[PDB]
RNA sequence: GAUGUCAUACUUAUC
């Protein structure tokens, strides 16, 4: 309920960059970025877990027009 | 040409495939032959510019229906149907003030676009495949 | 290999009663999975916040007593 | 005899410093009191490892040396690199002929410039506190941000030029913040154009 | 990660 899935991000984006992008709408408690350890590249998706479900829903509904490196980033509930 | 043997910052040799160290150069060449090294090796624009624009005079007839506009266009002699699209009034050639409405414009290739402003928010659908029709036998275009 | 599983402490059965009595094949693996998303989602059902005091907590009754004592 | 971690966490006033290995020691209460002290330093994490804290950075690339500005502002590094480049091209006969009749004046830069760099141009290094210990991954963990402020890298990646005018300098997610309202996780957050003046608060955010 | 034979290199102003 408090975890939102962010997709549509490029491989060049980093986890402190994603944390600084997500902190503009609310403090995120944790940020998990699944990446392959064999190649060292991200999969283009991440999970941001906030402190509450209402703040996560507000961050998912307020980040519907975010563009990173020319690619639109989508936020969904998970 | 071994892609695994590299030089460290201490003047030694390092095998990143097996992650081994060698002090002298004579031990790095003897480390390629062995069991662990063999195990590590086995484990690892044109249509827009050519469009003619003479801008003829269009003939649109609107009618308030209840449950639709009819645009009379000449013969285009092509299979390309005229397309309708709803846009905003924020983009213009001179940008007039107090422009906060929407306009549905129908455009064709040999003819100019005809635009009608809609003050309402949503009263119909401006989709092309849903509620539009173009009779090529009589060359009659309609959209509701 | 058996030597890499015997030297690193692998192939050792450990029971975690917090996340539905799950199984863990290592003490270091269980310590790494304690500060993870699965253990946090298991602890959020009981109402305990994700803090540093419940790192070595395994039983649900001991975690509930540690949450009620603070 | 040896109690579990739950009794050691409930008996001690600070259960955050209690570990799983401290329950099987000879004094759990004394270890819990010493680990939760005011100025105590924790034990390093390499005491339970098996690589002796020196076998992790085997194949990792590392720079040879990081020279400071006071040492690089004297012109000795370029002269040393030129001498190393000139000495690497000499053969054994050129090295043996230079030992009987050497050529004096190798660089001969200055004599008071090094004293001025070591006494007048002395710069203090970036030290640390005594509690901040060192580990194997401490040199690579540099990720350890504020609401209402954006860095240059995030502004270059998102394509948002930071300006004093609040027309386009806020991100385009501010329209959703104006339609839905302020974020519930930060009641004291003030954004220009909604709850703050636009020419006054030119930092695109204020935590008051 | 350990074992037991061989080789290389390093340290304590050792002689």
UniProtKB/Swiss-Prot annotation, chain A:
* Residues where Phosphotyrosine is found: 45
Q: Where in the cell is it found?
A: Nucleus
User: Where are the annotated coiled coils located?
Assistant: none
Q: Where is the RRM domain?
A: 2-78
Q: What domain of life is recorded for the organism?
A: Eukaryota
Return the similarity comment: Belongs to the SF3B4 family.
Q: Which disease is it linked to?
A: Acrofacial dysostosis 1, Nager type: A form of acrofacial dysostosis, a group of disorders which are characterized by malformation of the craniofacial skeleton and the limbs. The major facial features of AFD1 include downslanted palpebral fissures, midface retrusion, and micrognathia, the latter of which often requires the placement of a tracheostomy in early childhood. Limb defects typically involve the anterior (radial) elements of the upper limbs and manifest as small or absent thumbs, triphalangeal thumbs, radial hyoplasia or aplasia, and radioulnar synostosis.
Describe its function: Component of the 17S U2 SnRNP complex of the spliceosome, a large ribonucleoprotein complex that removes introns from transcribed pre-mRNAs. The 17S U2 SnRNP complex (1) directly participates in early spliceosome assembly and (2) mediates recognition of the intron branch site during pre-mRNA splicing by promoting the selection of the pre-mRNA branch-site adenosine, the nucleophile for the first step of splicing.
Protein's recorded name: Splicing factor 3B subunit 4
What species does this protein belong to? Answer: Homo sapiens
Q: State the gene name recorded for this protein.
A: SF3B4
Swiss-Prot record, chain B:
Q: Which residues form the signal peptide?
A: none
As stated in the Swiss-Prot or TrEMBL entry, residues carrying the post-translational modification Phosphoserine are 88
> Where are the Matrin-type Zn fingers located?
13-43
Superkingdom, natural source: Eukaryota
Q: Where in the cell is it found?
A: Nucleus
Family indicated by similarity: Belongs to the SF3A2 family.
Q: How does it assemble?
A: Component of the 17S U2 SnRNP complex, a ribonucleoprotein complex that contains small nuclear RNA (snRNA) U2 and a number of specific proteins. Part of the SF3A subcomplex of the 17S U2 SnRNP complex which is composed of three subunits; SF3A3/SAP61, SF3A2/SAP62 and SF3A1/SAP114. SF3A associates with the splicing factor SF3B and a 12S RNA unit to form the mature 17S U2 small nuclear ribonucleoprotein complex (17S U2 snRNP). Identified in the spliceosome 'E' complex, a precursor of the spliceosome 'A' complex. Identified in the spliceosome 'A' and 'B' complexes.
Its function, per the record, reads: Component of the 17S U2 SnRNP complex of the spliceosome, a large ribonucleoprotein complex that removes introns from transcribed pre-mRNAs. The 17S U2 SnRNP complex (1) directly participates in early spliceosome assembly and (2) mediates recognition of the intron branch site during pre-mRNA splicing by promoting the selection of the pre-mRNA branch-site adenosine, the nucleophile for the first step of splicing.
In its UniProt entry, what is this protein called?
A: Splicing factor 3A subunit 2
What is the native source organism of this protein? Homo sapiens (Human)
Encoding gene, per UniProt annotation: SF3A2
Swiss-Prot record, chain C:
Please identify the protein, giving its name as recorded: Splicing factor 3A subunit 3
Q: Quote the subunit structure annotation.
A: Component of the 17S U2 SnRNP complex, a ribonucleoprotein complex that contains small nuclear RNA (snRNA) U2 and a number of specific proteins. Part of the SF3A subcomplex of the 17S U2 SnRNP complex which is composed of three subunits; SF3A3/SAP61, SF3A2/SAP62 and SF3A1/SAP114. SF3A associates with the splicing factor SF3B and a 12S RNA unit to form the mature 17S U2 small nuclear ribonucleoprotein complex (17S U2 snRNP). Identified in the spliceosome 'E' complex, a precursor of the spliceosome 'A' complex. Identified in the spliceosome 'A' and 'B' complexes.
Q: What does this protein do?
A: Component of the 17S U2 SnRNP complex of the spliceosome, a large ribonucleoprotein complex that removes introns from transcribed pre-mRNAs. The 17S U2 SnRNP complex (1) directly participates in early spliceosome assembly and (2) mediates recognition of the intron branch site during pre-mRNA splicing by promoting the selection of the pre-mRNA branch-site adenosine, the nucleophile for the first step of splicing.
Q: Where in the cell is it found?
A: Nucleus speckle; Nucleus
Map the zinc fingers (Matrin-type) to residue ranges.
14-45
**What does the similarity note say?**
Belongs to the SF3A3 family.
- Where is it expressed, tissue-wise? Ubiquitous.
From Swiss-Prot, chain D:
Record localization: Nucleus; Nucleus speckle
What's the effect of swapping residue 58 to K? Does not affect methylation by PRMT9
Q: What's the effect of swapping residue 73 to K?
A: Does not affect methylation by PRMT9
At what positions is Symmetric dimethylarginine found? 51
Q: Which residues carry the post-translational modification Omega-N-methylarginine, per the record?
A: 51, 58
Recount the PTM note: Methylation at Arg-51 by PRMT9 is required for the interaction with SMN1.
Q: What is the effect of changing residue 49 to A?
A: Does not affect methylation by PRMT9
Q: What is the effect of changing residue 38 to K?
A: Does not affect methylation by PRMT9
Q: Where is this cross-link: Glycyl lysine isopeptide (Lys-Gly) (interchain with G-Cter in SUMO2)?
A: 35, 86
Ranges where the record places region Required for interaction with PRMT9: 1-93
What is the protein's quaternary organization?
Component of the 17S U2 SnRNP complex, a ribonucleoprotein complex that contains small nuclear RNA (snRNA) U2 and a number of specific proteins. Part of the SF3B subcomplex of the 17S U2 SnRNP complex. SF3B associates with the splicing subcomplex SF3A and a 12S RNA unit to form the U2 small nuclear ribonucleoproteins complex (U2 snRNP). Within the SF3B complex, interacts directly with SF3B4. Found in a complex with PRMT9, SF3B2 and SF3B4. Interacts (Arg-508-methylated form) with SMN1 (via Tudor domain). Interacts with RBM7. Interacts with ERCC6. Component of the minor spliceosome.
Return the protein name.
Splicing factor 3B subunit 2
Organism of provenance: Homo sapiens
Q: What is the lineage of its organism?
A: Eukaryota, Metazoa, Chordata, Craniata, Vertebrata
Q: Which residues of the full protein are shown?
A: 458 to 667 of 895
């Amino acid at each position: 309920d408090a975890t939102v899935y962010v997709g549509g991000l490029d491989e060049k984006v980093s986890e402190p960059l994603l944390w600084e992008l997500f902190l503009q709408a609310g403090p995120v408690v944790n940020t998990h970025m699944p990446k392959d350890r064999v190649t060292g590249q991200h999969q283009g998706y991440g999970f941001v877990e906030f402190l509450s479900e209402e703040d996560a829903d507000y961050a998912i509904k307020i980040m519907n027009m975010i563009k990173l490196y020319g690619k639109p980033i989508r936020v969904n509930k998970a | 040409k071994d892609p695994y043997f590299m030089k460290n910052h201490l003047g030694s040799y390092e095998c990143k495939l097996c992650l081994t160290l060698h002090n002298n150069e004579g031990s790095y060449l003897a480390h390629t032959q062995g069991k662990k090294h063999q195990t590590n090796l086995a484990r690892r624009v044109e249509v827009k510019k050519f469009v003619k624009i003479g801008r003829p005079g269009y003939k649109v007839t609107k009618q308030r229906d209840s449950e639709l506009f009819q645009i009379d266009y000449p013969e285009i002699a092509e299979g390309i149907m005229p397309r309708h699209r709803f846009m905003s009034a924020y983009e213009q050639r001179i940008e007039p003030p107090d422009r906060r409405w929407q306009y549905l414009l129908m455009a064709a290739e040999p003819y100019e676009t005809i635009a009608f402003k809609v003050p309402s928010r949503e009263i119909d659908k401006a989709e092309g495949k849903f509620w539009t029709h173009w009779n090529r036998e009589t060359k009659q275009f309609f959209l509701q | 290999p058996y030597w890499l599983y015997k030297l690193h402490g692998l192939n050792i059965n450990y029971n975690c009663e917090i996340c539905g009595n799950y199984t863990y094949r290592g003490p270091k693996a269980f310590q790494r999975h304690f500060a993870e998303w699965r253990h946090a989602h298991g602890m959020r059902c009981l109402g305990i916040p994700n803090t540093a005091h419940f790192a070595n907590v395994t039983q649900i009754e001991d975690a509930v007593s540690l949450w009620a004592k603070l | 005899n040896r109690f579990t971690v739950a009794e050691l966490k409930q008996l001690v006033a600070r259960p955050d410093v209690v570990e799983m290995h401290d329950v099987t020691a000879q004094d759990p209460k004394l270890l819990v009191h010493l680990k939760a002290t005011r100025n105590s330093v924790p034990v390093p994490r390499h005491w339970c490892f098996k690589r002796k804290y020196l076998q992790g950075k085997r194949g990792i690339e590392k720079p040879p040396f990081e020279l400071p500005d006071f040492i690089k502002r004297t012109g000795i590094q370029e002269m040393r690199e030129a001498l190393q480049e000139k000495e690497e091209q000499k053969t054994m006969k050129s090295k043996m002929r230079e030992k009987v009749r050497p050529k004096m004046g190798k660089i001969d830069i200055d004599y008071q410039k090094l004293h001025d760099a070591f006494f007048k141009w002395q710069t203090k290094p970036k030290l640390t506190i005594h509690g901040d210990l060192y580990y194997e991954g401490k040199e690579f963990e540099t990720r350890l941000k504020k609401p209402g402020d954006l860095s240059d890298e995030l502004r270059i990646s998102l394509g948002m030029p930071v300006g004093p005018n609040a027309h386009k300098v806020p991100p385009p997610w501010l329209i959703a913040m104006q339609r839905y309202g302020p974020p519930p996780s930060y009641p004291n957050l003030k954004i220009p154009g909604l709850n703050s003046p636009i020419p006054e608060s030119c930092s695109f955010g204020y935590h008051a």
